[PDB]
Amino acid sequence: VCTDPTQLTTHAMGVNIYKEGQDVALKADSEYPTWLFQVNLGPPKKLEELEPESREYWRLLRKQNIWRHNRLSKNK
Amino acid sequence: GVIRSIVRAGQAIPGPPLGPILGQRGVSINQFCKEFNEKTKDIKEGIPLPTKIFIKPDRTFELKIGQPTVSYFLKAAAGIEKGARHTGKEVAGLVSLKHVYEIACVKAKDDAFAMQDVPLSSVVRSIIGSARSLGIRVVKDL
Amino acid sequence: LREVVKTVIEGRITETPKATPDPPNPSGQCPICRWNLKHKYTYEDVLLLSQFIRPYGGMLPRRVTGLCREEHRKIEECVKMAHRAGLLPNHRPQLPEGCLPKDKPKLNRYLTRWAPKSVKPIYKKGHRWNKVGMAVGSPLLKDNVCYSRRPLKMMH
Amino acid sequence: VKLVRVQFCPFEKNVESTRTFLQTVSSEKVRATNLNCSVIADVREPCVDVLFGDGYRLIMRGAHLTTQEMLSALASHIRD
Amino acid sequence: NPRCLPPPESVRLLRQDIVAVFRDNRMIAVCQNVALSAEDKLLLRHQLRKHKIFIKVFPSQVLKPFLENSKYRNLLPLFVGHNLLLVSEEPKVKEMVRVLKSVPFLPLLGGCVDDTILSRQGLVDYAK
RNA sequence: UUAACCAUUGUAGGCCUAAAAGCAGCCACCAAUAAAGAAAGCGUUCAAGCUCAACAUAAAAUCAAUUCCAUAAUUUA
Numbered sequence: 215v216c217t218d219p220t221q222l223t224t225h226a227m228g229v230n231i232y233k234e235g236q237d238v239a240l241k242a243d244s245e246y247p248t249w250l251f252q253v254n255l256g257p258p259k260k261l262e263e264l265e266p267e268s269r270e271y272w273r274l275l276r277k278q279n280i281w282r283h284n285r286l287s288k289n290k
Numbered sequence: 291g292v293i294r295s296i297v298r299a300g301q302a303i304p305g306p307p308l309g310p311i312l313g314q315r316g317v318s319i320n321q322f323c324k325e326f327n328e329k330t331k332d333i334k335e336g337i338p339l340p341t342k343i344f345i346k347p348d349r350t351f352e353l354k355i356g357q358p359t360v361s362y363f364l365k366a367a368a369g370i371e372k373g374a375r376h377t378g379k380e381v382a383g384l385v386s387l388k389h390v391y392e393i394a395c396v397k398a399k400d401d402a403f404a405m406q407d408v409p410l411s412s413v414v415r416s417i418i419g420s421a422r423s424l425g426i427r428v429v430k431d432l
Numbered sequence: 433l434r435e436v437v438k439t440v441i442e443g444r445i446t447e448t449p450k451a452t453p454d455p456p457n458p459s460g461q462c463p464i465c466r467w468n469l470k471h472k473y474t475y476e477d478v479l480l481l482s483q484f485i486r487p488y489g490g491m492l493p494r495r496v497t498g499l500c501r502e503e504h505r506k507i508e509e510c511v512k513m514a515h516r517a518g519l520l521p522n523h524r525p526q527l528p529e530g531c532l533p534k535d536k537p538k539l540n541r542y543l544t545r546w547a548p549k550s551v552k553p554i555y556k557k558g559h560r561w562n563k564v565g566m567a568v569g570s571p572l573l574k575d576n577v578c579y580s581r582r583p584l585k586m587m588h
Numbered sequence: 589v590k591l592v593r594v595q596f597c598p599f600e601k602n603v604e605s606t607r608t609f610l611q612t613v614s615s616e617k618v619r620a621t622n623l624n625c626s627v628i629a630d631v632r633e634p635c636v637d638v639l640f641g642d643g644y645r646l647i648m649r650g651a652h653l654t655t656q657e658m659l660s661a662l663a664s665h666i667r668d
Numbered sequence: 669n670p671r672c673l674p675p676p677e678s679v680r681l682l683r684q685d686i687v688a689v690f691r692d693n694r695m696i697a698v699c700q701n702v703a704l705s706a707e708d709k710l711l712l713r714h715q716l717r718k719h720k721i722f723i724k725v726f727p728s729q730v731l732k733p734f735l736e737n738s739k740y741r742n743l744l745p746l747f748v749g750h751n752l753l754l755v756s757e758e759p760k761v762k763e764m765v766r767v768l769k770s771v772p773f774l775p776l777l778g779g780c781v782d783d784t785i786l787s788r789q790g791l792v793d794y795a796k
Numbered sequence: 797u798u799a800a801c802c803a804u805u806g807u808a809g810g811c812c813u814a815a816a817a818g819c820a821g822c823c824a825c826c827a828a829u830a831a832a833g834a835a836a837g838c839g840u841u842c843a844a845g846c847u848c849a850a851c852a853u854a855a856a857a858u859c860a861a862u863u864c865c866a867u868a869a870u871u872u873a
C-alpha cells in the first residue's frame with residue numbers, strides 16, 4: 215500500500231482499501247463542496263460551546279443528566 | 291435475538307466467539323458461515339465488519355451487515371495493530387483533515403450505522419470519537 | 433363512576449353523589465376544612481366515614497377524595513377503629529365465596545389503635561415506677577379538640 | 589383470538605381510552621404474542637370488536653371504560 | 669395547614685424545530701406510532717421521501733405546547749397521544765393514502781387538510 | 797426529585813485481555829436519531845442479553861407521647 219507522505223496527502227489511499235476499489239487520486243479542495251471541510255474538527259461541543267438553543271445542547275445535557283444518575287446508580 | 295459481532299470477513303468460522311455462542315441458542319453453524327461468506331465475497335476479506343445477526347426461535351438466520359469498521363481502519367491508517375495500554379493520552383498516529391473526510395463520504399451509504407444524516411457533522415464525531423477511543427490523535431495537519 | 437355490565441360487556445357512567453351546595457367554609461382547599469371539620473370528628477361519626485369507604489369497608493383512594501393526607505390518615509384510622517369496634521354493620525368484609533363467620537364470640541371493642549389479632553398479651557404489669565402503659569386512641573387524633581381540664585391520656 | 593377489530597372516529601369526539609388501548613393491540617410485540625389475531629384498525633361512541641374462534645365475541649367501548657380494564661379483560665380472555 | 673389554607677418553558681428550542689416543520693406543511697396526516705424504533709423512523713422518513721413527506725418528530729410531551737406558542741392554537745385534537753407525525757406541504761392525497769398501506773397495523777387518525785380537524789376517511793373525501 | 801413505562805444504532809471502540817463488546821482490567825468519554833449512559837445494577841465460557849437512567853411522567857407516605865403485684869380510666873367549662 216501507500217508509504218509516501220506526499221502520496222498520502224495527495225492521493226485517496228484510505229478511501230478504499232478493497233480489491234474492487236482502486237486507490238483514487240485527490241481532487242482539489244475547491245472541487246469539493248465547502249461543507250466537506252467546514253465540518254466540526256474541534257473537540258466535542260461542550261455546554262459552553264453548544265448553543266443553549268441547539269438540539270445537541272439539550273441532547274448532550276440529557277446525556278449529562280444520565281451521567282449524574284449513573285454515578286449515583288454505581289454507588290447505589 | 292440480535293447479536294452484534296465484529297468478526298473479520300476473511301474468517302467465516304472464528305470458532306469460540308461465534309460458533310458455539312450461536313450454537314448455544316441453537317443454530318446450524320455451517321449455514322451461518324455460508325451466508326457470512328456471501329458477504330465476504332462482496333466485501334474485502336480480512337477487515338472487521340459489524341454484523342446484526344438475529345437468532346429467532348425458529349432457528350433461522352437474518353444476517354445484516356454494513357460498511358467495514360472505521361475504528362480498525364483508523365488503526366490501519368495510523369499503522370497501529372496493537373495500541374497503547376491506555377490510549378486516552380497515548381498516541382502513535384496522526385490523521386489530517388483530508389483522510390478524515392474521504393472515508394466519511396463513503397460511510398454515508400448504509401442503512402445501519404445511522405448513516406442517513408444530511409449533515410456530515412454526524413459522521414465526523416463518530417470517527418473523531420472512535421479516534422479518541424483508539425491511540426490516535428486527529429490533528430488538523432502534519 | 434363507571435359500572436361494567438356483562439361475552440360482551442357494557443360500561444355506563446352513572447350518577448355520582450354531589451356535594452351539598454354552600455360549604456360552611458368556602459376557600460377551603462380540602463373538603464374536610466371546607467366544612468370546618470378539621471379537629472371535630474371522631475371514629476363515632478360513622479356518617480362522615482362511610483362516604484370515604486368502599487361498600488365492603490375498604491378505603492377509597494386519596495386522589496379521588498382529594499382530601500389532605502393529614503385527614504386521610506385520621507379518616508383511615510377512624511374507620512379502622514369503627515370497623516374493629518363493629519360500628520360499620522353495612523361495610524362488613526366480603527366473604528370470599530361462601531364462607532361463614534367463625535361463630536365464636538366477638539369481644540366488644542372501641543378506640544382500638546391496632547388489630548386485636550396482632551397484639552400480644554402483657555404478662556408483667558410492673559411495680560410503682562415500672563408500670564406498663566396501655567395505648568388508647570391514636571397519635572393521628574392528638575390535635576382533636578379536648579373539652580377536659582387536662583389533655584387526654586393516650587396511655588392508660 | 590382469531591381477529592381483533594378496533595373502530596373509532598377521529599373526526600367526531602374520540603375517547604382517549606379506546607385509542608390508548610388500541611395502541612397496545614397494534615403493537616409488534618403484542619401482535620407476535622397473539623399471532624393468530626388478524627389486526628384490523630377501523631378509523632372514521634368508539635367500538636372495539638374482538639372475535640374468538642370458540643364463538644366468544646368480545647366488544648369493548650372506551651367511552652365509559654378505562655384502558656386498564658380493557659387490557660385486563662383481554663389478557664384473561666387471551667389466556668383462555 | 670397549607671392544604672387547609674385559602675387558595676394562594678425549559679424545550680424552548682423544540683418550539684423552533686416543530687414551528688418550522690408545521691408552518692411548512694399545511695396538512696398533517698396523524699398516525700399513531702406502533703412502538704417503532706429510531707432507525708425504523710429514519711427509514712420511514714425515506715419511505716415518505718418516496719411520498720414527498722417527512723417524518724420530522726420530537727418528544728410529543730412538547731407537542732401539546734406547540735399550539736400554545738405557534739401559528740395555530742386549534743390543532744391539539746390532531747396531536748393526541750404519542751403518534752407519528754406525517755407533515756406534508758402538498759395536497760397529494762394518493763401519496764398520503766399509500767403511506768397507510770405501507771403498514772396495515774399502524775393506524776392513521778387522519779389529516780388536518782388546511783389545518784382543519786378531519787379524519788382519515790374525511791381526509792380522503794375532502795382531499796379528493 | 798421519584799413514584800410507572802419503555803427501551804434503537806454507530807462500535808465487539810482501542811488495552812497485555814483466547815475473548816472480553818457499557819458492564820475482566822483498561823480507555824479517553826463522543827454521534828445519529830424524537831430517545832440512549834461510550835454505562836448504572838443484572839447476566840457474564842466472552843457476548844447476546846434483564847432491568848435503572850434516555851423520550852413520558854406516575855402516584856404514594858422534620859421525630860412522638862421462685863410468684864403479676866391496688867383496681868381502673870382518654871372529654872360538664
Ligand code: FES
Nearest residue numbers: 462464465671672
Ligand atoms: S380540612 Fe383543610 S386541609 Fe383538610
